[PDB]
Design a protein around this ligand. Structure first.
Ligand SMILES: Nc1nc2c(ncn2[C@@H]2O[C@H](COP(=O)(O)OP(=O)(O)OP(=O)(O)O)[C@@H](O)[C@H]2O)c(=O)[nH]1
Ligand SMILES: Nc1nc2c(ncn2[C@@H]2O[C@H](COP(=O)(O)OP(=O)(O)OP(=O)(O)O)[C@@H](O)[C@H]2O)c(=O)[nH]1
Ligand SMILES: Nc1nc2c(ncn2[C@@H]2O[C@H](COP(=O)(O)OP(=O)(O)O)[C@@H](O)[C@H]2O)c(=O)[nH]1
Ligand SMILES: Nc1nc2c(ncn2[C@@H]2O[C@H](COP(=O)(O)OP(=O)(O)O)[C@@H](O)[C@H]2O)c(=O)[nH]1
Ligand SMILES: [Mg+2]
Ligand SMILES: [Mg+2]
Lengths: 431, 430, 434, 430
């Protein structure tokens, strides 16, 4: 009787959203048609009364090609026909269009579809939202939807899986603008944010997976695996179960600080997978390796606020405890002074699944960690510097002002980043 | 959805458009009689963008052919794929402009503009959701420059929220085919800078160099020059008709490429172009594309892009390829050649990927770059304008149909002010 | 529950490592693909690591800046043994330039190499020490070896390190600049290695020609001898013996002073099958061939100096009482003389596993063998001649411009000469009588 | 992956390259159509050093053919293995130099060389990790001796840390082909000593002597001379392409052979070389190979090494052999010829072993030696040059297009300084 609703807005969210659904359907044995050939599917799916199951998800976009691609793909018979919301005119990399010009006539239908799904559920745990942050409808609609849901539902937990721009590799030129404006919205309206920039995921594919030409198809499979590990405790019995509500109560020291970065292990191709044993003692070491961070950040430049790692497979409670004590012995990993213990550990029985046509090798153990560290202050600084250069000469500004946005909205957005950074510096200093 | 109507004017524009419609039809598998004969279903998914459905199962392009004399439209109808055009869309007069901007914009332009504006209004009304307009014409001719820029203002006044393209062939002096080119070219740019949302400049001189140097073919003609331009036109909106990894419709291109409202003059290039005898010696991958992409001679303009600094540049890749290879290359180029790239904006290159390559090739790319070196175009033309206007040569014809010397001075000042603010950002330091 | 990690750097180090790993695999009975045949355990735990089901992985890492030798290993019959990401290869060789391998290129590989070393060491619980192999006369061998030792010292501390270096021969030589990079490498290793062994190439040629009756020895033949020496040295850790000797029972019995840890090697019997069975090869006679001066594996004559200490190992069916009589006979003999402040100078180890014979090799099968590692004052001569060569070269500053322009200052050569002179003075004052 | 590109200049350079590429293709099993038909796997594992991959599974050499007159390259394009080269890489002038260093370095080199720099850049930095450049040319011809050395200068300026190698043909007066040889030879030597990392000297007189005496064939040809030169060139870089007991590349050879920065003029020789009638009367063994190697007549220069002292020597052995035998032979030679080896460089021979011999041979050796005897060539060339320059003969042709007598005086001064510095170490004692 526990349910979670997933929101996929923009092209970045939808394509990542698709990859999540081959994995969820494969775990529970649901065919693409939706008919099974006990009540563990209730977290994501819902019985129709006789036969098929429908996902508890809604796809939002304004540009039809990606949605029409789904509606004609192999999963045409899975999703409900009227929960794939498709528009006519794309936001076109403009935050003002998706928040002031387009989004005013879009949310009303969107909240109707959310309402219909929510009333069907009975034990709604929370919402999951996916959106690339450096885009028009990604941040323009995401900011509007999160604000609306904050007053419609109130205390429900909203988890955000965003994709921030890489330090030097990007596909857009105006993305430093619409990224900053989005921060002021999701800083005060999202309970949990995850750092999932693209450049770091490229490096993992090249080094660990032995892939020399990674593609967006490859990346979304990795992100889908993290989602499964995060919510594995809701639908699979285990020795130590952790609910969705048992993230904020253990990872958020203060309401302002809710930006964490994730890591996954092991990620090894089948060519050299079982050329080594993959013990439980070593997988927890690979999780803490700074190169395996899914975000382009260095944890060695700051302290650790709190750590939460989820184990799935055939691990046993003896070995995590032995491994964790080893980590505290390490000198290169240093925690903040006022937090003596900072690990929250969960253990599950269901091993990770393998998708046909994939890249990851099947293993009997895996670990996924969500770590809160002060080192994440670097990504805000580097994006802040990029915004300062362009806004110095008011480049690209006339595009935003013409779409109903005020001139001074940038100024109040810039101050929030400066306010946010000083919070991280203040927390890190020992007493 | 998000369809666009095509309107072409003048002799140069009609020849450009006729070849363009031949290129599009082959991509969608449309027979010269308007009957679909394709093989893949993807060719028919987004056909409503360019074509209109008629009873009996045939497709008709939503193109409007406007000109002043029936001479050229006799030629376009007898050519291949000429049967597609609707006879109701042929709007034209009987007198002719005679390479006179005054005649093509004030006297004969006024009386024929009602008919052409009426058929345009009908087509824009019929479609579900309009995306914008694209226009092909020449800035040296009377009909193309005269009614061409006049129809810009009338359409913009009625559809202020839509986008507008102009594929303009500016007159180069090295290969000049008209003695009064500087006059009607200067007056057109003045009106074009105020209304057109995107302007793309083409040279006959540059296209001649490409044929002689890259393709290395013996006897080129306007049939081949039109082909190079027509390939670029279809590559810009390819992601609007086909699925892709990073689809980016035209509105997205305008936002990324235009920093300031008055700087919207781009230069186009296409790749890969190879000679027939040397097409089996090269390797066709992502790297070899971006080398030909950024080379100076591959551009379709006489202006040297290395004499100035790129404000912003864009690329559109067609085919199946890896995004990591594309993204690293654009960063990699921008780091080795940091001198040619303006400093006060970081990562000034945008990239897109479309999954359907052009027929006959496995990979292709179209390069659109807004460079500060385009100032050489307006400077050199303005020198010719001030030379002939000082002696008032050829001016009695223009003053014969209502214009006065005050307008000529106003146009020259606006262009000279355009270069001043366009070169101003070249030396700007962060 | 005892482990050891072996490091191979340089072409010569990789070549000798290939032979020694072939020898270890043959001795422990593992197929070249890593799979145990057919179907008494933990005998391989010293060198290998179980994958949990079937195959094994060696505890080694291969280093080089040029892929010519490395790619051979990834393609040969042993392609299934080594883990694919512990055969680390560069792109540009140091080209016999110490400066290139210590200041320009070597600083881009050392981080990855140390990451691999951590990934190997965190999986072991009883590491006795490190084994490092390198040829000193090459650029990357001297450069990366010195950088590796410098980083491992600070990163680990008191863990023992054993370096089986190969100094250039007195007159036989391959390169022309190799006197230069020997001095800097020796200065680097002196205060960073715990035990060093001298294995110059010329002596091994003489041993082969005299004993195995080979008139054209090749690098393949030499590597087998070094592999057998390593096997004899390390068999006491992984095989049951009557009088066991661990790795840590070397730095308590062989080096009287911290600065004096350079020592020679000798192996016996080395004999071919055509004359192996014409004598009984008793323990009484094999120990004489060990101390025979021409049988020393280094081109140094112990007759020119005193003996400091001698740690020597037996394996086979040797009886402890038989060893004592031979030691007494050697002490009675007058031609061999020890320092006065060392009344007892023998450390003897006895093991039960006989020396395994490699098929297609050169040595025959013998029930007994002895490996001798001695420390003596006679080693002073090898540095003096190399000092003279370096001085002759550096008198008018030849080949120096190939080192200055790669980051090394002019004065670096002067400091190493002072270190060598001080080292020679230290041996002289240690060897003087009271 | 540590690959080396090829640039050939002048008629002599083109003739050298047209045979070198044939030799390399024969060695690596590449058909004249560019399709691999080899016999083992070792022939393809390091093929990337000299070749590039193109679509269709064919290989193309990474060579750049530059010259001033199209006759030579038209001749070499129609010959066997002439279809391998990419037709783009052909760059040619229209007028030629006419055996004039001034014309080849100032008046046509400046105009043409931009394109060849563009193609050299493209080929060089399209590689994974460049190893260096190698150039073939002659110092007796104007266009080669001038444009090639200007190319050396610009390439060295753009790539300061790469390896530069040149196979130079020095004109001899005994068999003279041009009356203006001393001028351009002196100028080329002056411009080359400052830039080139490695230089080797080849003499047609010595080639004729070898062909007449050792091979004992009645009528040698430029084909035969180019064949010997090609074998010598392949011998140096075989070790970079094939595995061996002791691997050693160009940088290692340069470091071990160059004592002082300005002493980089070597002489080479090859062994074995036996006539057809006496080919099997001999026995391929290391002592015979090394004695024929160190034979003074076998060297490819008229400079007799017995008139001076070897600073260093290098020997690259190809095949399977015993390193103990190789070292013993080297030590024996160095002890038996103590007079000809300078004493303050003990053990002054470098040795190498490569397991893959040349096709058709079981054992072969490439020798590179730096001996103090080459100063005789410099002395004789300087004497002829100063004899001609005393009376200002042929001076107006060189001075008519930019140069003055001051540069000739500077060239004489630098040439004499090189001679004095290089003979200084001949009599030096330890
Ligand atoms: N991880 C991942 N990121 C993607 C993918 N596709 C796009 N992105 C990111 O999305 C950013 C730009 O947004 P878009 O994907 O173009 O679409 P959008 O965010 O919805 O904004 P619009 O273009 O207005 O629709 C890029 O910088 C990419 O980093 C994907 O398939 N996987
Ligand atoms: N025992 C033994 N020594 C070797 C062997 N090969 C090379 N050496 C020694 O190595 C020295 C030169 O170094 P190399 O092995 O050629 O290569 P390196 O040490 O990696 O140095 P670089 O050549 O710069 O890469 C020589 O003086 C030899 O004494 C071998 O197969 N066996
Ligand atoms: N690309 C291309 N350009 C053309 C063609 N025909 C003419 N032109 C160019 O158009 C210019 C003259 O335009 P013009 O015919 O006067 O335009 P009009 O007066 O509107 O008909 C000349 O400079 C030509 O270079 C053609 O078929 N293709
Ligand atoms: N070894 C060799 N030397 C050649 C060949 N052809 C010409 N030469 C030499 O090159 C010299 C003339 O060079 P030249 O043709 O003027 O060179 P260019 O001016 O660069 O074209 C003569 O002295 C010849 O000895 C050849 O095929 N092989
Ligand atoms: Mg989009
Ligand atoms: Mg080496």
């Amino acid at each position: 009787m526990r349910e979670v609703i997933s929101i996929h807005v923009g092209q970045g969210g939808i394509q990542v959203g698709n990859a999540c659904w081959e994995l969820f359907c494969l775990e529970h044995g649901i065919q693409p048609d939706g008919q099974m050939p006990d009540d563990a599917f209730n977290t994501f799916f819902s019985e129709t009364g006789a036969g098929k199951h429908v996902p508890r998800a809604v796809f939002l976009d304004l540009e039809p090609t990606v949605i029409d691609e789904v509606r004609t793909g192999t999963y045409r018979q899975l999703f409900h026909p009227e929960q794939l919301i498709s528009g006519k005119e794309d936001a076109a990399n403009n935050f003002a269009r998706g928040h002031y010009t387009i989004g005013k006539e879009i949310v009303d239908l969107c909240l109707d579809r959310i309402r219909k799904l929510a009333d069907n559920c009975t034990g709604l745990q929370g919402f999951l939202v996916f959106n690339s942050v450096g885009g028009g409808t990604g941040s323009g609609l995401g900011s509007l939807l999160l604000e609306r849901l904050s007053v419609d539902y109130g205390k429900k937990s909203k988890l955000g899986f965003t994709i921030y721009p890489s330090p030097q590799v990007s596909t857009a030129v105006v993305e430093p603008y619409n990224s900053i404006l989005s921060t002021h919205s999701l800083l005060e309206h999202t309970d949990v944010a995850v750092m999932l920039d693209n450049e770091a995921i490229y490096d993992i594919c090249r080094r660990n997976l032995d892939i020399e030409r990674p593609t967006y198809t490859n990346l979304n499979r990795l992100i889908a695996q993290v989602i499964s590990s995060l919510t594995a405790s809701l639908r699979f019995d285990g020795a130590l179960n952790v609910d969705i509500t048992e993230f904020q109560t253990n990872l958020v020291p203060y309401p302002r600080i809710h930006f964490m970065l994730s890591s996954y292990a092991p990620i090894i191709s089948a060519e050299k997978a079982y050329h080594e044993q993959l013990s439980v003692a070593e997988i927890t070491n690979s999780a803490f390796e700074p190169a395996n961070m899914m975000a382009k950040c260095d944890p060695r430049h700051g302290k650790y606020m709190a750590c939460s790692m989820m184990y799935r497979g055939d691990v046993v409670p003896k070995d995590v405890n032995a491994s964790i004590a080893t980590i505290k012995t390490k000198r290169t990993i240093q925690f903040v002074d006022w937090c003596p213990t900072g690990f929250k550990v969960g253990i599950n029985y269901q091993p990770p699944t393998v998708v046909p046509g994939g890249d990851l090798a099947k293993v009997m153990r895996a670990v996924c960690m969500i770590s809160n560290s002060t080192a994440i202050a670097e990504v805000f600084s580097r994006l802040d510097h990029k915004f300062d250069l362009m806004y110095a000469k008011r480049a690209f500004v006339h595009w935003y002002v013409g779409e109903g946005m005020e001139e001074g909205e940038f100024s109040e957005a810039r101050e929030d980043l400066a306010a946010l950074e000083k919070d991280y510096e203040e927390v890190g200093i020992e007493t | 959805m998000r369809e666009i109507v095509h309107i072409q004017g003048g002799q140069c524009g009609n020849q450009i458009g006729a070849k363009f419609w031949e290129v599009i039809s082959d991509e969608h598998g449309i027979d010269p009689t308007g009957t679909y004969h394709g093989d893949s279903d993807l060719q028919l998914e987004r056909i409503n963008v360019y074509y209109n459905e008629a009873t009996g199962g045939r497709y008709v392009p939503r193109a409007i052919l406007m000109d002043l004399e029936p001479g050229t439209m006799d030629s376009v109808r007898a050519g291949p794929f000429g049967q597609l055009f609707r006879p109701d869309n042929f709007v034209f007069g009987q007198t002719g402009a005679g390479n006179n901007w005054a005649k093509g914009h004030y006297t004969e332009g006024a009386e024929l503009i009602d008919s052409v504006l009426d058929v345009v209004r009908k087509e824009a009304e019929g479609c579900d959701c309009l995306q914008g307009f694209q226009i092909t014409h020449s800035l040296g001719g009377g009909t193309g420059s005269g009614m061409g820029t006049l129809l810009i203002s009338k359409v913009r006044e009625e559809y202020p929220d839509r986008i507008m393209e102009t594929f303009s062939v500016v007159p180069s002096p090295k290969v000049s085919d008209t003695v009064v080119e500087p006059y009607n070219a200067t007056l057109s740019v003045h009106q074009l800078v105020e209304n057109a949302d995107e302007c793309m400049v083409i040279d006959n001189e540059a296209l001649y160099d490409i044929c002689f140097r890259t393709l290395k073919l013996t006897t080129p003609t306007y049939g081949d020059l039109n082909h190079l331009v027509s390939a670029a036109m279809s590559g810009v909106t390819c992601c609007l008709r086909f699925p892709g990894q990073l689809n980016s419709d035209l509105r997205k291109l305008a936002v990324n490429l235009i920093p300031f409202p008055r700087l919207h003059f781009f230069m186009i290039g296409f790749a890969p172009l190879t000679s027939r005898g040397s097409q089996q010696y090269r390797a066709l991958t992502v790297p070899e594309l971006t080398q030909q992409m950024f080379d100076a001679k591959n551009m379709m303009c006489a202006a040297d892009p290395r004499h100035g600094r790129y404000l912003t540049a864009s690329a559109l890749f067609r085919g199946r390829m890896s995004t990591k290879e594309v993204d690293e290359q654009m960063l990699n180029v921008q780091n080795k050649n940091s001198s040619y790239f303006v400093e006060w904006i970081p990562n000034n290159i945008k990239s897109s990927i479309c999954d359907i390559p052009p027929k006959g090739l496995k990979m292709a790319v179209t390069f659109v770059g807004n460079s500060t070196a385009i100032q050489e175009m307006f400077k050199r033309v303005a020198e010719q304008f001030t030379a002939m206007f000082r002696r008032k040569a050829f001016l009695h014809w223009y003053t014969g149909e209502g214009m006065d010397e005050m307008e000529f001075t106003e146009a020259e000042s606006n262009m000279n002010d355009l270069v001043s603010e366009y070169q101003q950002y070249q030396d700007a330091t962060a």
